[PDB]
Design a protein around this ligand. Structure first.
Ligand code: A1BR8
Ligand code: ZN
Length: 139
């Protein structure tokens, strides 16, 4: 679980989106595991507008924040699930770190703000769905 609350938007993993998220749908991309929905309350999350490759992410499975080096957003293959078939997920950044089912939603942050959220993992790796390119979240 976990979400980014920026302005009048809520950003969540598309596979974890609720009925309210779908009822108040703004934008969704299956290939990125992102869903953005509208919220009546003003949220204060600063989105990073950078090309950082180091940051800190929150790991719910360890109740700890971890510093990580991560790759540039790219198209990386991800295996089937009760949510998605086997496909290439886009705008995904890999990092060496701990993650296990239940960690999706944990925010990855850098000095410039929110970079993205935990979307994939396993094998001593953690994958993050980038949100820095979504410029409309601030406007
Ligand atoms: N974005 C997706 O396709 C995910 C949908 C839910 C299932 N996906 C996963 O990666 C499940 N998972 C998540 C984390 Br975090 C760590 C591990 Cl070890 C793991 O197996 C894939
Ligand atoms: Zn940054």
């Amino acid at each position: 679980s976990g979400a980014i609350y920026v302005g009048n938007y809520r950003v969540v993993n598309r596979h974890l989106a609720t009925h309210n998220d779908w009822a108040n749908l703004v934008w969704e991309d299956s290939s990125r595991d992102l869903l953005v929905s509208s919220t009546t309350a003003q949220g204060c999350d600063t989105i990073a507008r950078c090309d950082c490759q180091t940051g800190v992410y929150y790991c719910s499975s360890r109740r700890k924040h971890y510093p990580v080096s991560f790759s540039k957003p790219s198209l990386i293959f991800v295996e089937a699930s009760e949510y998605y078939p086997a496909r290439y997920q886009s705008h995904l950044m890999l990092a060496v770190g701990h993650s296990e089912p239940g960690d999706c939603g944990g925010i990855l942050r850098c000095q410039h703000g929110v970079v993205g959220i935990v979307s994939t993992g396993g094998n001593g790796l953690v994958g993050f769905a980038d949100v820095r390119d979504l410029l409309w979240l601030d406007e």
